[PDB]
Structure formats: C-alpha cells, structure tokens
Amino acid sequence: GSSGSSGEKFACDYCSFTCLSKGHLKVHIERVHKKIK
Ligand SMILES: [Zn+2]
Numbered sequence: 472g473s474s475g476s477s478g479e480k481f482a483c484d485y486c487s488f489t490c491l492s493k494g495h496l497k498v499h500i501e502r503v504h505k506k507i508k
Contacts, residue, residue, distance in 0.1 A: 480489045481496045485504040490496055501507065 475489070477489065480491050481493055482489045483496065483499060483504075485500070488499055488503075490499065
C-alpha cells in the first residue's frame with residue numbers, strides 16, 4: 472500500500488499537506504501560510 476492517501480481527509484489550499492480534522496487544517500493555515508496578529 473501507498474505511504475499517503477486522500478481518503479476522507481481534508482487538504483491544504485497552499486501546499487501538499489492533509490489531515491483528518493478541519494481544526495488541524497485551520498491551525499495549519501493560521502500558523503504556516505497566515506500568522507496570528
Ligand atoms: Zn499548507
């Protein structure tokens with residue numbers, strides 16, 4: 472089997488990142504592609 476998959480997971484709009492939680496996607500965008508101010 473493959474080392475990664477799309478499955479039923481959420482994906483980043485800016486890079487090749489994926490996660491099972493929408494909260495983890497929000498935290499990824501808010502810290503990696505945007506910042507807290
Ligand atoms: Zn990303």
